[PDB]
Amino acid sequence: EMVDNLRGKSGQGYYVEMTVGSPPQTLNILVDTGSSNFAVGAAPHPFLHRYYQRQLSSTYRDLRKGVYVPYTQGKWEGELGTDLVSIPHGPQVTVRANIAAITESDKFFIQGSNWEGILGLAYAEIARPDDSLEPFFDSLVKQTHVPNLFSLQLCGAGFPLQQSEVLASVGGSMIIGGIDHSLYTGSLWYTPIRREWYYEVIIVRVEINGQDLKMDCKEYNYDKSIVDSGTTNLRLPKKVFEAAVKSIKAASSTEKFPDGFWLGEQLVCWQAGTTPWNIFPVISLYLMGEVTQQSFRITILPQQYLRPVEDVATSQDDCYKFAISQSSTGTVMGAVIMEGFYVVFDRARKRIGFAVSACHVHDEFRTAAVEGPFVTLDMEDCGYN
Amino acid sequence: EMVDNLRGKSGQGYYVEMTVGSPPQTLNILVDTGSSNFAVGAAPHPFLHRYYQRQLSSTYRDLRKGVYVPYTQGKWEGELGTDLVSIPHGPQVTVRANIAAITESDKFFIQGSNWEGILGLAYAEIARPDDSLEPFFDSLVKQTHVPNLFSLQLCGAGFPLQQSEVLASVGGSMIIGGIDHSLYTGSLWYTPIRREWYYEVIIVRVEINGQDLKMDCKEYNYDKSIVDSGTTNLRLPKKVFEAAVKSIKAASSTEKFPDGFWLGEQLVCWQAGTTPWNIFPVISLYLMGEVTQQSFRITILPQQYLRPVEDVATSQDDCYKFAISQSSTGTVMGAVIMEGFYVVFDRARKRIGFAVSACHVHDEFRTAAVEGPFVTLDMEDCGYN
Numbered sequence: 001e002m003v004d005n006l007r008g009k010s011g012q013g014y015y016v017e018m019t020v021g022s023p024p025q026t027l028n029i030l031v032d033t034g035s036s037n038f039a040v041g042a043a044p045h046p047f048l049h050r051y052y053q054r055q056l057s058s059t060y061r062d063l064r065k066g067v068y069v070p071y072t073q074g075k076w077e078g079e080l081g082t083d084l085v086s087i088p089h090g091p092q093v094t095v096r097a098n099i100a101a102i103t104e105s106d107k108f109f110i111q112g113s114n115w116e117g118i119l120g121l122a123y124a125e126i127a128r129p130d131d132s133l134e135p136f137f138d139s140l141v142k143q144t145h146v147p148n149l150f151s152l153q154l155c156g157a158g159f160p161l162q163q164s165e166v167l168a169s170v171g172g173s174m175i176i177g178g179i180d181h182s183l184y185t186g187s188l189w190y191t192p193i194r195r196e197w198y199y200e201v202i203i204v205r206v207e208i209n210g211q212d213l214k215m216d217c218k219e220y221n222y223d224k225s226i227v228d229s230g231t232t233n234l235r236l237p238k239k240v241f242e243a244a245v246k247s248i249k250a251a252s253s254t255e256k257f258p259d260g261f262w263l264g265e266q267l268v269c270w271q272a273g274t275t276p277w278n279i280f281p282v283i284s285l286y287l288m289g290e291v292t293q294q295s296f297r298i299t300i301l302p303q304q305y306l307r308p309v310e311d312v313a314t315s316q317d318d319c320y321k322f323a324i325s326q327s328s329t330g331t332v333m334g335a336v337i338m339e340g341f342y343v344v345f346d347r348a349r350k351r352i353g354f355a356v357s358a359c360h361v362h363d364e365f366r367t368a369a370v371e372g373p374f375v376t377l378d379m380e381d382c383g384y385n
Numbered sequence: 386e387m388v389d390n391l392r393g394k395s396g397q398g399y400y401v402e403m404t405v406g407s408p409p410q411t412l413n414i415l416v417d418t419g420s421s422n423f424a425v426g427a428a429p430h431p432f433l434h435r436y437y438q439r440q441l442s443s444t445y446r447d448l449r450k451g452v453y454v455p456y457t458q459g460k461w462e463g464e465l466g467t468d469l470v471s472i473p474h475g476p477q478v479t480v481r482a483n484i485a486a487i488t489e490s491d492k493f494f495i496q497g498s499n500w501e502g503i504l505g506l507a508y509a510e511i512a513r514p515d516d517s518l519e520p521f522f523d524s525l526v527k528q529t530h531v532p533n534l535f536s537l538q539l540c541g542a543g544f545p546l547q548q549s550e551v552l553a554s555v556g557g558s559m560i561i562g563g564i565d566h567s568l569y570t571g572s573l574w575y576t577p578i579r580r581e582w583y584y585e586v587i588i589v590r591v592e593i594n595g596q597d598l599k600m601d602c603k604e605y606n607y608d609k610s611i612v613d614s615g616t617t618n619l620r621l622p623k624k625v626f627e628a629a630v631k632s633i634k635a636a637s638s639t640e641k642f643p644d645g646f647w648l649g650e651q652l653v654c655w656q657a658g659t660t661p662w663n664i665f666p667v668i669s670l671y672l673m674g675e676v677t678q679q680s681f682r683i684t685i686l687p688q689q690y691l692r693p694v695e696d697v698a699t700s701q702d703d704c705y706k707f708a709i710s711q712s713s714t715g716t717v718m719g720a721v722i723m724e725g726f727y728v729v730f731d732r733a734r735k736r737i738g739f740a741v742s743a744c745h746v747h748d749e750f751r752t753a754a755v756e757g758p759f760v761t762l763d764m765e766d767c768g769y770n
């Protein structure tokens with residue numbers, strides 16, 4: 001029913017079909033756990049397949065307020081309204097929610113992409129222009145008996161997605177209100193959401209094919225550590241990045257490659273038949289557990305951090321980006337982490353659960369894993385203030 | 386002659402008119418000291434006014450090599466060639482240089498912008514795909530008697546630039562081969578380029594309306610510190626950023642404003658007639674001088690770090706971005722720093738000189754300044770490895 005309701009790209013994000021207004025207008029909306037606004041294209045920007053036409057809806061109501069969201073040299077800007085929203089491949093209910101009608105933008109929409117708005121599933125406190133603008137999911141829970149949780153299985157699997165292989169090779173599932181046991185194996189292990197703004201969690205130890213990085217663990221969460229479906233890469237604060245980089249470098253001497261590859265300034269390339277996965281180490285993050293002194297680890301492969309970028313001449317040349325990178329925003333657990341796992345955003349219990357995804361990419365030697373319990377101390381002082 | 390040869394925006398960069406091929410094709414090219422490729426639009430992307438048509442030029446030569454330049458979720462990609470380049474409002478000479486013909490891109494070109502390529506004036510070692518691709522300015526110096534230096538005066542002044550106020554309100558000067566005394570007052574003070582890759586310099590002390598930040602000075606240059614005409618903001622490593630932020634916050638209590646403003650997640654707004662400049666502190670960077678134990682300081686105002694963003698309803702509401710921000714790439718001295726000064730990229734002597742620009746924005750109370758000499762110790766260990 002809601003299984004397989006997501007399409008598009010690890011690399012251009014995952015989008016769900018929604019309806020807005022009466023009669024219902026269908027749009028593809030990117031699912032974004034790193035933000036808190038529901039915002040849709042409202043004018044004919046050339047890159048968009050479609051856009052919200054308020055004229056055509058009886059339930060539209062103006063809030064007479066504008067909103068302006070700068071990000072990194074780009075922006076979007078819009079006018080705030082409310083209307084009636086549904087999700088065709090979601091729970092059978094209709095909510096009135098805030099909608100930012102996007103009317104100007106730069107470096108927001110992506111040419112070639114097939115989605116036309118964003119669903120921010122994170123918390124009010126990061127809602128623009130301010131926390132009073134009640135986020136969609138809050139609204140969906142206030143106005144119905146749908147339970148206060150959702151889960152995500154991000155796949156992006158078989159062979160490279162495109163624009164009739166973005167439509168017709170559907171890349172994962174959003175289960176609204178629940179958890180489906182068919183989407184994972186073993187058990188869920190749960191880390192507490194440290195605060196309800198982004199989905200902040202505390203990472204307490206990092207390992208690369210076995211080897212601790214013996215750093216203050218305040219530096220794994222420096223500024224913050226977050227789970228974010230709108231981000232493609234595994235992103236790591238400078239010190240941890242440089243440190244991880246060096247030991248990923250060391251673990252990897254088996255074969256060799258250039259400086260700027262590690263910094264995402266050039267991309268990497270070998271023959272097909274001839275991917276060298278073994279010379280790459282597993283990455284392991286330990287996260288804070290539900291109990292004092294107890295952690296669990298999730299473990300990902302290079303399958304998920306060396307992630308195909310769209311071929312030289314769709315040939316047999318294989319070209320990927322190192323999907324780990326730097327940040328001054330904290331640790332960002334994006335699709336590289338998420339496509340390893342079924343992720344349960346248990347908002348009622350203030351926690352995030354992780355299990356091994358039933359669709360994750362692997363082989364026969366290794367695998368993605370979730371394992372505990374482990375004994376780890378001074379865990380909440382891995383945080384930052 | 387070359388005075389006033391630059392147009393466009395602090396915010397969409399500065400561009401110079403160039404010609405490529407025979408007969409000569411005119412293009413607007415962004416001047417970028419943070420990169421090392423000469424790269425121009427080569428196909429009809431909708432955002433471009435014009436583009437390089439190799440078909441039309443007899444002197445074009447194919448190098449049969451491609452190049453692919455990922456940056457932050459965006460990219461450009463091109464095919465490498467050489468042709469004959471001139472600069473109409475520059476030294477009267479013609480060079481054969483490398484040209485990357487751009488054939489695919491994402492989040493590179495800007496809609497509304499009026500430039501169509503980039504001139505990278507920095508060093509080979511950061512030339513894509515590799516250092517063997519000889520940068521334009523190297524080529525311009527190998528093939529002529531034009532001296533090995535250029536200087537820049539970035540203004541962006543009177544009233545807000547646009548698209549007939551981007552054309553017709555010309556925002557600064559690039560003097561190729563020389564230095565014009567009419568563009569500055571007082572004297573040039575010179576900091577050594579620590580290494581020829583980017584224009585890396587070492588910052589040795591920071592002050593805010595007088596008050597040191599008493600941090601290790603290894604952290605002002607953490608990763609690196611660079612002078613970059615392609616960047617709009619003053620950008621500062623996390624620790625220095627947070628630390629600068631806090632004392633900019635403290636100096637500024639006089640009046641008050643929100644959390645996310647400081648983080649560029651929302652923008653700031655007051656009445657006209659009613660800009661409150663005084664409640665903002667000067668920023669002072671000390672940089673390494675040409676002599677052991679000796680530094681000099683440059684000093685900028687909020688005029689240059691609180692920088693107008695394009696009006697609510699072109700009204701009297703005044704709305705600006707805090708132009709200082711975070712990085713994991715090092716310190717980046719962009720237009721906020723540069724529009725304060727005439728900047729001399731003295732490549733032959735391996736140094737960068739700074740003087741007070743004759744066009745910089747100020748008032749009657751304060752001013753931008755260049756001052757020395759100062760006594761500062763342990764200066765080269767402010768560097769990083």
Ligand SMILES: CN(C(=O)CC[C@@H](C1CCCCC1)N1Cc2cc(Oc3ccccc3)ccc2N=C1N)C1CCCCC1
Pocket residue numbers: 013030032033034035069070071072074075076106107108118228229230231329332458
């Ligand atoms: C391409 N996208 C991103 O790169 C999102 C970056 C990501 C941040 C979240 C905080 C930690 C660092 C990574 N975000 C932030 C975000 C920003 C945003 O505002 C604009 C405005 C103009 C241009 C671009 C972004 C909107 C949504 C955000 N959600 C995040 N996960 C976007 C692509 C749109 C879909 C969201 C991700």
Ligand SMILES: CN(C(=O)CC[C@@H](C1CCCCC1)N1Cc2cc(Oc3ccccc3)ccc2N=C1N)C1CCCCC1
Pocket residue numbers: 073398415417418419420454455456457459460461491492493503613614615616714717
């Ligand atoms: C909008 N632009 C930038 O934001 C440039 C960022 C700036 C970096 C330099 C290193 C320190 C951190 C700031 N750069 C890097 C740079 C990257 C680049 O490659 C792409 C590829 C696709 C999309 C965007 C950029 C090309 C030139 C660069 N030069 C810098 N100063 C660009 C806008 C194009 C004009 C250059 C600045």
